Design a protein around this ligand. Structure first.
Ligand SMILES: *[C@@H]1O[C@H](CO)[C@@H](O[C@@H]2O[C@H](CO)[C@@H](O)[C@H](O)[C@H]2NC(C)=O)[C@H](O)[C@H]1NC(C)=O
Ligand SMILES: OC[C@H]1O[C@@H](O[C@H]2[C@H](O)[C@@H](O)[C@H](O)O[C@@H]2CO)[C@H](O)[C@@H](O)[C@@H]1O
Ligand SMILES: OC[C@H]1O[C@@H](O[C@H]2[C@H](O)[C@@H](O)[C@H](O)O[C@@H]2CO)[C@H](O)[C@@H](O)[C@@H]1O
Length: 304
């Protein structure tokens, strides 16, 4: 009841990015609908599913779908929506295609029309333009988000929310520093949500189980919250995590507390990450015994 959406990322289909196309069961896998079902049972209602653009539409952004990869991916998506939860389709590509930064709004628009055409009637799907643009020109990033919106709506997918992401890994703490221009995005359906990510280790990389302090999360979302409220925009924390210790748990709690106090603009949050190949990853939300499952799931359920 704190937020409209609260759930988790479901990783695996984006693994082994060095091997394109790669081999299912070896370089990558698709998420496990049984574990997902466990998390739905815990009360989560949104699941973000990363995938690789190059595996979904090989060779050129304007090309055809890879039927095998698309069918494995859409099985998970349609499992999530068939249970009533929102499913975020996430090209997990950092603004790049075969390593080169994306610089064609028309090719990107075509990619998004091809992809969104396959989910056009599913009002539980959420489209994510791209995961964590970075080290690119801001005008190109804004232009690519606009082109993604254009392709999604032109394909007849007009009822779905679209999660836009900014430059600088779409970090919340740096949002007003690099991504103010993102205010100028439009959508014929008026369903734009600004997705930001926030980790609590010193550099915000989310690669350590140690946080800066028990208060760093809230501190790192203040300015983004003010920006959302000032410009009449909506936001979602598409990625966040903390280590299995008291300081990190208090910092996550304080951050989520601040967001819930500002739920007029903050539509929810999604933990990074669940999925079947994480093993003892420091942030694993995957049942039955991921580190974050055991240390954090009960904490997150308090916001459900
Ligand atoms: C997908 O997730 C399910 C649920 O966690 C896995 O099933 C468990 O598998 C273990 C194997 O030792 C069984 O002992 C448990 O009883 C199962 N739990 C439940 C609740 O079903 C399943 O193995 C996973 N599949 C893949 C491909 O990883
Ligand atoms: O952990 C092994 C696994 O890592 C995958 O990359 C991870 C990365 O380790 C993590 O720091 C980041 O948050 O997520 C990415 C995947 O989204 C890698 O793709 C796999 O090949 C590897 O097995
Ligand atoms: O936000 C997760 C993201 O972190 C990336 O590291 C960034 C960091 O986010 C940013 O605050 C800092 O200024 O730059 C570093 C890069 O050196 C990381 O590269 C990603 O894998 C990760 O998804």
């Amino acid at each position: 009841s704190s937020f409209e959406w609260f759930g988790s990322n479901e990783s695996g289909a984006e693994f082994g990015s060095g091997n394109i196309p790669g081999v299912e069961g070896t370089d990558y896998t698709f998420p496990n609908t049984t574990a997902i079902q466990i998390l739905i049972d815990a009360g989560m209602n949104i699941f973000r599913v990363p995938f690789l653009m190059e595996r979904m539409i090989p060779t050129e952004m304007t090309g055809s779908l890879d039927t095998a990869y698309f069918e494995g991916y859409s099985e998970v998506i349609n499992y999530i929506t068939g249970k009533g939860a929102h499913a975020v389709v996430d090209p997990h590509n950092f603004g790049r295609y075969y390593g080169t930064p994306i610089s064609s709004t028309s090719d990107f628009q075509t990619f998004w029309s091809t992809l969104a055409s396959q989910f056009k009637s599913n009002d539980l799907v959420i489209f994510d333009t791209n995961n964590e643009y970075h080290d690119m020109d801001e005008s190109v990033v804004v232009a690519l988000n606009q082109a993604a919106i254009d392709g999604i709506r032109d394909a007849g997918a007009t009822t779905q929310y679209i999660f836009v992401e900014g430059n600088a890994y779409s970090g919340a703490w740096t949002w007003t520093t690099y991504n103010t221009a993102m205010v100028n995005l439009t959508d014929p359906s008026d369903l734009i949500v600004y997705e930001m990510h926030q980790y609590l280790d010193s550099d915000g990389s989310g690669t350590s189980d140690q946080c800066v302090s028990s208060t760093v999360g809230q501190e790192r979302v203040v300015d983004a919250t003010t920006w959302l409220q000032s410009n009449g925009k909506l936001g979602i924390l598409g990625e966040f995590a903390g280590g299995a210790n008291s300081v990190c748990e208090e910092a996550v709690e304080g951050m989520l507390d601040y967001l819930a106090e500002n739920s007029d603009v903050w539509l929810g949050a999604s933990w990074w990450s669940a999925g079947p190949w994480w093993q003892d990853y420091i942030y694993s939300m995957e049942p039955p015994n991921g580190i974050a499952y055991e240390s954090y799931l009960s904490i997150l359920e308090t916001y459900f």
